[PDB]
Design a protein around this ligand. Structure first.
Ligand code: NA
Ligand code: NA
Ligand code: NA
Lengths: 235, 299, 256, 210, 243, 224
RNA sequence: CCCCCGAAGGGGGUUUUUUUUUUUUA
């Protein structure tokens, strides 16, 4: 339960059988045997309870797989009749972004996004049989939900764990040690993409360098130091 | 398609960074990457590391028959077949590709045709036998600079390699395992080293074709991010004899001739360091091998 | 040209099958289209020719030579065909190559004795064809270019063989001509245009040498849309038509 | 060769009127198949055809069927590639005259002719081999359920191969490659007799077998 | 060994160190085969260049929504040399390198971006060869592309310069290309900027710049020649078309 | 007795990567996936595999094709393919050193290829049905002994050579299935089953060691 | 965004061959 435990694919699942458990990433329900089996190597994670506990396996991954309610940063790679063709990651299957999927959008009023533009969006549909769909608005009300174009910044490739940790964990010091040196705008994409823009190009470059170096290092406490050495503006 | 999707913000960012004399990895424009050359196991096995770029070369030889046209020369081939291991943008063995053909041709002109290897020293007997030396490059990780890394790997490998001693009695030859007789190195005449300059156009094409005050930016040993955004590329191969082994500016952004000359000279400045480094590392390898033998003969 | 509509094909066919046949440009069944030929423009080669047709079809032929032992090389004449836009692997290119090689076989295509230098050595003739452009079956085009090239071919003069440094002897030989005919209904057409070839029921390749209807003779589909069978009397018509209207092509090509 | 085991490169190769049997439908992984074996005095041949199709084609929409014909050397590399492709082209013409292509838009019919055996004890043999190719291809096409306006037949005489349809009234194929000079009419007659016999045998095979 | 450069300052063909070979060009030589075309003679080099396009892409792949596709086909005929080559050259790595070189040369000169969703096929036939063939290819391409009416920023003049000992020799023939290292230059217009710079054999660094100096100059002359033809061919076919 | 060297996450521009070393056999493997497949590779209901094996010397041949075939036979039931319909997994193995006489044997290379591929698949984050481990085994000419992890020398005098790749579940205690058994040479049934028992034990050892190697460098990447 | 209508609808982003060792040395 509360104690997270390392686990390999094929290992025996150690949660309570009588207790109902909703299954997240890492845990696979075999279609033929109806057995609950782990399929990813990593840390097994069981949430407290509520109404049913979530069992999921946090595993090291670099390749993003679209799931609903995810905040992603894509790049427009194509224009269609009623949608944009978007790339969330190189070599991955593209994602659709409806023309209707914008605030104050009608058939007469179209969005002004071109090929090569950065878009910050929410994965609204991620069916296993269909192409994934993203959106740049509140699907309910139809108004702006903090989504849209990202202009003149710099993008940073990062592993999924780092990005998830960056968006959800508030005890993560990278944003804090960055704020200690300069003012910056940041967009966090669970697809492993981090967008950063400062007023000065120098500062944005510094942010880029320190974020990537922080990404390569497993130790969290080092960050501050790195940031220092990076904002000392060495070459 | 397998295309690398680059965004407008990224292109503009890197280009603007070049305008403000900045490179992403913190190098100056004329700064070649720290070359890490590592030998291991048998002779002719070398690993070369330029920053994140990782290549591996394996030298080998086998007895064969000399070509009918060339009676006194041995056989030497170099293979540089890319794989998806370096990156998914590469298709498995597209030898007919632009950058593939270019790379292969540059390496071939740098090493195989420059006479860097003594081919006539490979000949065992003029009529029936000769050595067939092979240099197989394995591209492990791509962050740019594959041509240079390949050249360094191939050369270091060829110089590190040793073929088994043999002797000849007419029709027949006698080949030896290491215990029988010590192996002997190949005939290296010179050490060709390649340096690749990348050219960026900060302004518009009109300024490049019909504009004064040439603002064309040149950098050395571009990374993958830099290589993907460049408008031009030059590869210059030189040796410590101040010889231009070869030069390849196969189109791209038109550059002023004087700038290209300056590039050649700076490249020489770099190949000095690289050559001395190769020789040094080689001698250290041999010395450590000898001292190991000395540690083996007496417990 | 190619890819005509069904209406166009029906019109053209009806005109070409009527009696007498009405050809799209008003040509007589035995009339050729205007062509012009240039020779001796490639100095490096022993012979050379260039032929241009009115429809744009252009071909270039080079004649080169090399000394060979008859005993090791029984074939003293080799035809290599290169058509632009077509790979060397292509079916039509190898078909044309084979055909031409057979028309020019040293066996009886041409007189082998004219090539002999010594009882052990001779000149092998390399005929290199480069079809720059073609809108119909280029076999006659190529054949004519080769004829012109061979009739203006010069070889080094013999005096192991040694040769005169400055003086050269004109290669004397009667090169064969290959003719192509379109079978449309009950009508035979010489020098078929592209549009004519698009609706032709069939085709006839007929070789010709020293004033005689010689082999190879082929039936050839000029298309894949309207390939139909034909009666033997048509074949006889084609042969008679060639041997009737061939000596004038020969005298037209051989007058320099 | 990187896709084949050709062994050492240093090595060099070692230098040193007729009865008919017709059968169809013995090859299971194709649509049509035909075995044709011929036996004349001091001369024996045998070849097999396989019709794969109607299959899909790569490229733009085609209004009719597209036929391909592939001749494969059997045992001995007996013939030149150019001549094989030439004969292939000839046969393509013939069966472009015979097959009902209108029925098969955006579709390809691939025919393979394996020349397994061709040993004639008598001491340019392509000509004598063509009519059996045509026989086998017609048989295999009829076996594949590929529509034919007629049964393409053929005969050979004095280096002259002539392929007929419609009871020998009209010509779908004519091949003449040296093989001496004789008048056309008797070659036509002999080849027509061969054609008629082959036709009878083929329909017979198509009535005892299919 | 023989007097490549006599003390009198003459070469085997009778040229001096800084003189081009005979250079003649013809435009619109194949109006029924291509949109643009050029027949070119440089010394003994005889080349046919055909430009087909801009036109609809053969495949519905190879189609670019932002720019035209540029392809170059170099056919070195088997009869281009004195000794006929029994082997085709079409798939040789040398020819592929030449092709990609020419493509990447004219990608930066031809305004491909104003011809999106089109393909421009360049078809070249080398009828005769006598050294310095690369520059010849370049010139042929320039001529034919201009004849096609396809927009470009400037001329690109191709030339070759050999290096005999201390002295550089302009526009080398076959004999000079052997027993000597050569530099090929693709010069943009009248500028000092190089589209192409090719060195395939060893050359002393300290003497390279000098080799370029004459080369550029030579290329300029070549430009002046090509230009001189075009204008004439223009002046002729703009006056006769009138009335 | 049997000690191996193994590293994880050594390549930058792939999703997963591994380096496997046993004796003198050295193989580096990379994995990219799940990514978009080309139309000819695409499968409607499951993951498609593109598998590549490169030799240490020379250029890829039919030998490496057979290696790819057997590697595919091992990795296919290993991967939970139905989790990634219409997707591709790119698996490439570069043999750095054969550690065996290439002309006569390739079992060391195969085994190390399987191990490295498994490790890289783990590093990539791709759903696996279970764990896996492969070892080379030889039977010698005169001694007729069964040597696990035989040297090149031992191979030269071998009477038979064997590749044993086993599938493990439940902490590496249970043998789910035999993924691959490639036996070549002269041998009998008794020898075979002795070889299988010893082989299974040694492979279990290898599974344990591999588990430790995996946890050692995966654990620091993750959060408590 | 262009296209009609009139005062919102319907359609569209193009799936070479010039010929007696060694050393220092008036
Ligand atoms: Na079809
Ligand atoms: Na110029
Ligand atoms: Na001058």
């Amino acid at each position: 339960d509360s104690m997270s435990t390392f686990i390999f694919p094929g290992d025996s699942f150690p949660v309570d059988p009588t207790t109902p458990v909703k299954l997240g990433p890492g845990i696979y329900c075999d279609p033929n045997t109806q057995e609950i089996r782990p399929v990813n190597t990593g840390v097994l994670h069981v949430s407290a309870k509520g109404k049913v506990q979530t069992a999921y396996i946090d595993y090291s991954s670099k390749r993003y797989i679209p799931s609903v309610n995810d905040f992603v940063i894509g790049v427009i790679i194509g224009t269609f009749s009623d949608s944009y063709k978007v790339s969330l990651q190189n070599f991955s299957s593209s994602v659709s972004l409806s023309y209707m999927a914008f605030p104050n959008a009608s058939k007469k009023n179209r969005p002004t996004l071109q090929v090569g533009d950065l878009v910050y969006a929410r994965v609204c549909t991620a069916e296993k049989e269909l192409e994934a769909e993203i959106e740049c608005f509140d699907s309910t009300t139809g108004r702006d939900a903090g989504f849209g174009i990202l202009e003149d910044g710099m993008i940073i490739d990062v592993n999924l764990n780092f990005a998830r940790q960056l968006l959800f964990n508030n005890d993560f010091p990278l944003l804090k040690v960055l704020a200690a040196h300069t003012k910056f705008e940041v967009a966090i994409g669970l697809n492993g993409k981090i967008w950063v823009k400062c007023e000065e190009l120098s500062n944005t470059l510094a942010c880029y360098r320190t974020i990537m170096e922080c990404c390569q290092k497993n130790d969290t406490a080092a960050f501050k130091d790195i940031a220092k050495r990076q904002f000392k503006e060495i070459l | 398609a397998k295309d690398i999707e680059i965004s407008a913000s990224e292109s503009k960012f890197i280009l603007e960074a070049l305008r403000q004399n900045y490179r992403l990895d913190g190098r100056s424009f004329d700064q070649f990457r720290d070359v890490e050359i590592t030998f291991g196991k048998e002779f002719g096995d070398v690993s070369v590391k330029m920053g994140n770029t990782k290549v591996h070369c394996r030298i080998s030889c086998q007895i064969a028959q000399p070509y009918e046209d060339r009676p006194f020369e041995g056989l030497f081939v170099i293979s540089t077949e890319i794989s998806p291991m370096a990156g998914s943008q590469f298709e498995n063995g597209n030898i007919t590709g632009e950058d593939e053909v270019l790379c292969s041709r540059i390496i071939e002109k740098s090493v195989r045709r420059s006479g860097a290897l003594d081919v006539e020293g490979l000949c065992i007997v003029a009529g029936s036998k000769c050595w067939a030396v092979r240099a197989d490059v394995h591209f492990l990780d791509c962050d740019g600079g594959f041509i240079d890394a390949s050249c360094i790997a191939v050369m270091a490998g060829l110089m590190h390699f040793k073929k088994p001693d043999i002797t000849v009695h007419g029709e027949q030859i006698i080949v030896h395992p290491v215990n029988e007789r010590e192996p002997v190195p190949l005939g290296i005449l010179h050490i060709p080293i390649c340096v690749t300059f990348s050219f960026f156009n900060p302004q518009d094409t009109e300024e490049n074709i019909k504009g004064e005050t040439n603002s064309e930016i040149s950098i050395i040993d571009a990374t993958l991010k830099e290589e993907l955004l460049r408008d031009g590329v030059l590869t210059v191969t030189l040796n410590k004899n101040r010889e231009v082994v070869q030069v390849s500016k196969a189109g791209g952004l038109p550059m002023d001739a004087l700038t290209l000359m300056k590039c050649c000279h700076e490249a020489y400045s770099i190949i000095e360091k690289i050559t001395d480094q190769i020789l040094q590392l080689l001698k250290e390898d041999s010395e450590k091998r000898n001292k190991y033998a000395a540690m083996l003969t007496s417990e | 040209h190619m890819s005509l509509s069904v209406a166009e094909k029906s019109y053209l066919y009806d005109s070409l099958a009527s009696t007498p046949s009405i050809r799209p440009d008003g040509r007589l069944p035995h009339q050729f289209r205007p062509i012009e030929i240039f020779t001796d423009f490639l100095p490096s080669s022993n012979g050379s020719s260039r032929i241009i047709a009115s429809d744009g079809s252009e071909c270039i032929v080079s004649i080169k030579s090399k000394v060979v032992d008859h005993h090791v090389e029984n074939e003293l004449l080799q035809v290599d065909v290169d058509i632009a836009g077509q790979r060397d692997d292509a079916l039509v290119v190898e078909t044309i190559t084979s055909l031409l090689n057979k028309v020019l076989k040293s066996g009886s295509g041409v007189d082998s004795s004219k090539l002999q230098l010594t009882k052990k050595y001779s000149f092998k003739i390399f005929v290199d064809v480069l079809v720059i452009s073609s809108h119909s079956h280029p076999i006659s085009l190529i054949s004519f270019a080769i004829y012109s090239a061979l009739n203006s071919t010069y070889l080094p003069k013999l005096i192991l063989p040694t040769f005169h440094d400055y003086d050269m002897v004109k290669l004397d030989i009667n090169p064969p001509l290959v003719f192509i005919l379109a079978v449309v209904g009950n009508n035979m057409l010489l020098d078929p245009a592209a549009n004519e070839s698009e609706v032709a029921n069939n085709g006839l390749i007929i070789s010709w040498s020293n004033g005689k209807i010689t082999s190879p003779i082929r039936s050839v589909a000029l298309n894949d849309s309207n390939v139909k069978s034909f009666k033997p009397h048509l074949l006889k018509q084609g042969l008679a038509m060639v041997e009737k209207y061939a000596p004038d092509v020969v005298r037209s090509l051989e007058n320099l | 060769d990187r896709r084949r085991l050709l062994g050492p490169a240093a090595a060099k190769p070692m230098a040193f009127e007729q009865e008919l049997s017709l059968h169809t439908g013995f090859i299971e992984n194709c649509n049509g198949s035909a075995l044709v074996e011929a036996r004349s005095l001091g001369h024996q041949t045998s070849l097999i055809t396989a019709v794969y199709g109607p299959r899909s084609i790569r490229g733009s929409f085609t209004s009719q069927g597209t036929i391909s014909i592939q001749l494969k050397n059997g045992l001995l590399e007996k013939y030149n590639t150019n001549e094989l492709k030439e004969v292939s082209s000839f046969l393509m013409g013939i069966f472009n005259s015979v097959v009902n292509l209108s029925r098969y838009p955006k579709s390809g019919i691939d025919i393979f002719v394996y020349l397994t055996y061709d040993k004639d004890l008598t001491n340019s043999q392509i000509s004598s081999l063509i009519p059996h190719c045509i026989t086998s291809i017609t048989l295999a096409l009829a076996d594949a359920g590929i529509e034919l306006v007629d049964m393409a037949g053929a005969g050979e005489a004095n280096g002259t191969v002539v392929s007929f349809i419609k009871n020998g009234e009209e010509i779908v194929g004519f091949w003449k490659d040296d093989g001496d000079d004789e008048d056309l009419l008797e070659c036509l007659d002999r080849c027509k007799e061969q054609y008629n016999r082959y036709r009878d045998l083929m329909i017979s095979c198509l009535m005892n077998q299919e | 060994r023989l007097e490549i450069y006599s003390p009198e300052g003459l070469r085997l063909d009778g040229r001096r160190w800084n003189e081009l070979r005979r250079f003649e060009s013809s435009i619109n030589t194949h109006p029924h085969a291509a949109d643009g075309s050029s027949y070119m003679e440089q010394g003994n080099n005889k080349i046919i260049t055909l430009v087909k396009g801009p036109k609809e892409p053969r495949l519905k792949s190879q189609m670019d929504t932002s720019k035209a596709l540029l392809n170059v086909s170099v056919n070195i005929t088997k009869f281009s040399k004195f000794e006929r080559s029994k082997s085709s050259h079409k798939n040789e790595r040398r020819v592929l390198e030449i092709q990609t070189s020419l493509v990447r040369m004219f990608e930066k000169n031809v305004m491909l971006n104003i011809y999106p969703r089109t393909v421009i096929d360049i078809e070249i036939h080398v009828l005769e060869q006598d050294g310095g063939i690369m520059g010849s290819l370049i010139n042929g391409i320039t001529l034919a592309l201009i004849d096609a009416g396809i927009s470009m920023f400037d001329y690109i003049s191709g030339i070759s310069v050999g290096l005999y000992d201390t002295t550089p020799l302009l526009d080398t023939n076959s004999l000079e290309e052997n027993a000597m290292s050569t530099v090929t230059l693709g010069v943009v217009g009248k500028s000092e900027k190089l589209s192409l710079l090719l060195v395939e054999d060893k050359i002393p660094l300290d003497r390279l710049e000098n080799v370029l100096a004459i080369g550029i100059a030579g290329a300029h002359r070549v430009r002046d020649l090509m230009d001189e033809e075009l204008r004439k061919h223009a002046q002729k076919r703009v006056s006769n078309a009138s009335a | 007795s049997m000690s191996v060297q193994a590293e994880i996450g050594i390549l930058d521009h792939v999703d997963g990567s591994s380096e496997f070393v046993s004796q003198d056999t050295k193989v580096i493997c990379s994995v990219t996936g799940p990514i978009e497949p080309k139309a000819r590779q695409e499968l409607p209901t499951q993951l498609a595999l593109e598998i590549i094996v490169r030799p240490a010397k020379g250029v890829a041949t039919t030998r490496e094709k057979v290696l790819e075939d057997k590697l595919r036979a091992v990795l296919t039931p290993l991967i939970t393919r139905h989790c990634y319909p219409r997707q591709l997994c790119q698996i490439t193995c570069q043999i750095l050193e054969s550690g065996e006489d290439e002309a006569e044997f390739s079992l060391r290379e195969l085994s190390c290829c399987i191990n490295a591929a498994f490790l890289a698949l783990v590093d990539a984050g791709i759903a696996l049905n279970s764990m896996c481990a492969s070892i080379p085994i030889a039977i010698i000419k005169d001694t007729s002994d069964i040597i696990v992890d035989p040297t090149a020398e031992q191979l030269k005098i071998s009477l038979s050579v064997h590749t044993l790749a086993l599938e493990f579940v439940n902490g590496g205690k249970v043998v789910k299935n035999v993924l691959l058994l490639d036996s070549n040479g002269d041998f009998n049934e008794d020898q075979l089953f002795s070889l299988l028992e010893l082989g299974e034990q040694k492979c279990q050892e290898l599974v344990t060691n591999i588990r430790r190697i995996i946890q050692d460098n995966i654990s620091p990447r993750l959060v408590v």
